[PDB]
Design a protein around this ligand. Structure first.
Ligand SMILES: Cc1cc(C)c2cc1C(=O)NCCCOc1cccc(c1)Sc1cc-2nc(N)n1
Ligand SMILES: [Mg+2]
Length: 216
């Protein structure tokens, strides 16, 4: 094929977010399973936004009426994907929410961690997404909002992330978090383990969750 050109935007994480990610990555914590509760909670919050917006404006559901969460483990590429049909993020929402803007709870949470707090407290500080780095070496976030095109955010930490127009499968609307799992965190690809953690932490979220299991 003739050589194609793709635009990429590399951003530096806000300093405190980068410090938080280094803490999460380089420190042992028990109870790493709470990452899934945090991502399902973000999906539920996003699904609430489209549900309520759609009450006044039904055309907001022209990108899909079904409000749900899908969990997709893939043992072949060692990824766990959390997909929702929530509001999604415009390019600006994506850059603003995933690393460039100082998060209100980062400073207090790092101090709490430095005082020996359990990593499970992360969600209360509004930085729950970053718990993905307890189990993932890289995270890819695909997002599609009704007012913009589909974007792909990615980071392997190291203080930077990239944003580009997504060349993968278009989604109608919502967000997909792809966790590229660490070699010692493959239990999160096992359906029994996923069911255990969803029953423990994510029973009352407000939307149906479907677990897709690859046939053996
Ligand atoms: C840090 C972060 C990462 C992701 C992938 C999502 C949300 C957040 C976060 O902490 N957001 C703060 C609350 C405002 O959140 C939103 C603002 C605009 C759009 C969205 C969420 S949709 C969304 C964002 C995040 N996760 C999901 N599944 N959906
Ligand atoms: Mg909620």
């Amino acid at each position: 094929q003739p050589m194609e050109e793709e635009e990429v935007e590399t951003f530096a994480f806000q300093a405190e977010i980068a410090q938080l990610m280094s803490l999460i990555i380089n420190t042992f914590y028990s109870n790493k399973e709470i990452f899934l509760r945090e991502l399902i909670s973000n999906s539920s919050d996003a699904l609430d936004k489209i549900r309520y917006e759609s009450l006044t404006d039904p055309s907001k559901l022209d990108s899909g009426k079904e409000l749900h969460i899908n969990l997709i483990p893939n043992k072949q590429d060692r990824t766990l994907t959390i997909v929702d049909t929530g509001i999604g993020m415009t390019k600006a929402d994506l850059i603003n929410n995933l690393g460039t803007i100082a998060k209100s709870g980062t400073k207090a949470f790092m101090e709490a961690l430095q005082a020996g707090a359990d990593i499970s407290m992360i969600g209360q500080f509004g930085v729950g997404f970053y718990s993905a780095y307890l189990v993932a070496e890289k995270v890819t976030v695909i997002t599609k909002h009704n007012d913009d095109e589909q974007y792909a955010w990615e980071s392997s930490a190291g203080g930077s992330f990239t944003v580009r127009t997504d060349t993968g499968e278009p989604m109608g609307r919502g967000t997909k978090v792809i966790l590229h799992l660490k070699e010692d965190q493959t239990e999160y690809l096992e359906e029994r383990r996923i069911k255990e953690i969803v029953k423990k932490h994510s029973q009352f979220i407000g939307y149906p969750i479907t677990l897709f299991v690859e046939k053996e």
